[PDB]
Amino acid sequence: MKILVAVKQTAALEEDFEIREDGMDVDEDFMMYDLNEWDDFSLEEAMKIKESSDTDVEVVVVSVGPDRVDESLRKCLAKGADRAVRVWDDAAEGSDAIVVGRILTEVIKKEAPDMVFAGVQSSDQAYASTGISVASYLNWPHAAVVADLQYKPGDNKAVIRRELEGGMLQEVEINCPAVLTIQLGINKPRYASKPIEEVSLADIGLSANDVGAAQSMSRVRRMYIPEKGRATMIEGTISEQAAKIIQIINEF
């Protein structure tokens, strides 16, 4: 019994970040990397399944990315993931959600898990695409935005609740194995803050022609800092800031 959890090490930008000279991305000097928030919940959900079960449940985390990602994978192991896999070659640089979907699927075909979990979206690019792309390449049952999962290892169906717009859920009975994209709030990750197996493209039968920017389903023309709305910033002491809020409250 095996749950494979696809995880992403996301980038967040520091203040005063700048676009690269080529205009295709932000300068990496301004990026701080950490595990995608959604992945904390997906991993916790797999761990909850492992702990609920008498049957052995192997929890394997898999990420497609460069060597920085090892740090995130190690923390997943420290939190109780059984194994961790990083897939990379430089040729994979610029791979969009669909291409990463394809790469992940090549690993999943070999791991042959009973369930695959992915986050609903990434905090950085927020494609909300990768997990469901995996489901397509696997040709597996799937559901996106899962806020509750009723599943016992070995079951050929699960009941999920998807979190919908406007404060409602929908119960869905789904065939297993399945790919599920996991939503914030499904659980309360306990650690709220074994080597890593390194896999090349060759190791999974892929080449530069299968991956990277040229194989993606859109091309970046440019990235830029848009002019956005600007607030009226109330400077001063805490007293005068509060005083101004109350004046606005009284105006209202």
Add this chain to the structure above:
Amino acid sequence: SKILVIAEHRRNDLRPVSLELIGAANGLKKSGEDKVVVAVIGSQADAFVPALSVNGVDELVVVKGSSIDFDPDVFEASVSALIAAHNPSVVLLPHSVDSLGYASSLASKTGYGFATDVYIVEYQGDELVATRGGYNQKVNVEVDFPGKSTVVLTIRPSVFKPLEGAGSPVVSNVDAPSVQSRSQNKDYVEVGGGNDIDITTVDFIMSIGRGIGEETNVEQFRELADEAGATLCCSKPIADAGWLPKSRQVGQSGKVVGSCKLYVAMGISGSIQHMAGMKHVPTIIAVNTDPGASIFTIAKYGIVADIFDIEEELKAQLA
């Protein structure tokens, strides 16, 4: 050329985003001669033709599938067949929870052009150029789709304006491809939690976010809200944690505070999903120690200050 628009309905109601997409599609097309094709999918979807017989709909296709409401296998098969039948240059889906279920699967099989959560779209010559966010909304990423004769876009809700008035589309009925879905929809659910106040009716909100830190800190903001005469609401994480009821949650998956005239956002970054519930509010005050917080891009007033210090001083001054 044809632009295909996939409408969205749930629980017998058409989701308004459907009309936003039609607005988008009509704005997008290159000549008058171009046609907007709208499809509505569901086992009882004929119900929606009046609501979809609106300005800017040239053709309305009612697709009868096995499920009443969204099912990802049904929708994927159906939309694939629509694309096959209509050869659209562009397919517009809402960036909605339903679309999340299948949009990127559709795009994986066929290598159509694909981009999600798009909030600018135009033709430059014959080149489709879509813009979406990057790095937690801190940049715009502008993309095109070289050599893709069909591009599938999901469209950010509440960005594109609907057209006004009725239309006279040619209405057709098709059966969805015969696919046995690998899931079955069961009950819709509204989960427990207190519901003493309907936050869509209230005019003055103080809303708290993850910046409050610990559940022990909720009480002081409840007190401030009480003293000010505001209704206490929150962002999703606060409700997720059980610290306030889900009925107080503002945003896409919570409530839209349609009645709110003054919204004080405290320790809330301003995610797109939170903004969906409150960006319409005519006076938004944001209190947040991160000047790079998205919330400041829609707030009228910004205070870059510690929320606890502000809360204490507000309390003192009000009393």
